[PDB]
Design a protein around this ligand. Structure first.
Ligand SMILES: *[C@@H]1O[C@H](CO)[C@@H](O[C@@H]2O[C@H](CO)[C@@H](O)[C@H](O)[C@@H]2O)[C@H](O)[C@H]1NC(C)=O
Ligand SMILES: *[C@@H]1O[C@H](CO)[C@@H](O)[C@H](O)[C@H]1NC(C)=O
Lengths: 49, 48
């Protein structure tokens, strides 16, 4: 909360447990390569519950 | 013939197979296993 962001992007998608580990900056898999690829220089984070 | 075997030997006697004189397209390796960890060190799957 000590940060000033210009723009915030809020993507949400429901996905499996191991694909939670799959989603990360620069990963591989059936989802990380064909569904949602995050940037290698990703300035941001992911949330899973 | 290496991924769909039935008797992957125990760790005490790790069976080793040699792969040569063929063409490797690891998409079959991708789709023949629900990968849990593809931790590689000297090479990467994207271009394998
Ligand atoms: C390791 O696993 C290999 C699976 O491809 C085995 O290769 C097979 O071996 C049988 C004989 O056991 C051959 O008939 C077959 O054509 C194939 O080459 C390999 O033998 C095995 N090695 C050990 C030491 O178990
Ligand atoms: C070869 O792979 C198929 C697909 O997973 C599997 O159903 C079959 O049992 C495998 N063969 C042997 C001998 O286990």
């Amino acid at each position: 909360n000590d940060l000033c962001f210009t723009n915030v992007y809020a993507d949400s998608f429901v996905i499996k447990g191991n694909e939670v580990s799959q989603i990360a900056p620069g990963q591989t898999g059936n989802i990380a390569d064909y569904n949602y690829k995050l940037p290698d220089d990703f300035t941001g984070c992911v949330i899973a519950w | 013939e290496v991924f769909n075997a039935t008797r992957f030997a125990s760790v005490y006697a790790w069976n080793r197979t040699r792969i040569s004189n063929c063409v490797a397209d690891y998409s079959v390796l991708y789709n023949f296993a629900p990968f849990f960890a593809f931790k590689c060190y000297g090479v990467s799957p994207t271009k394998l």
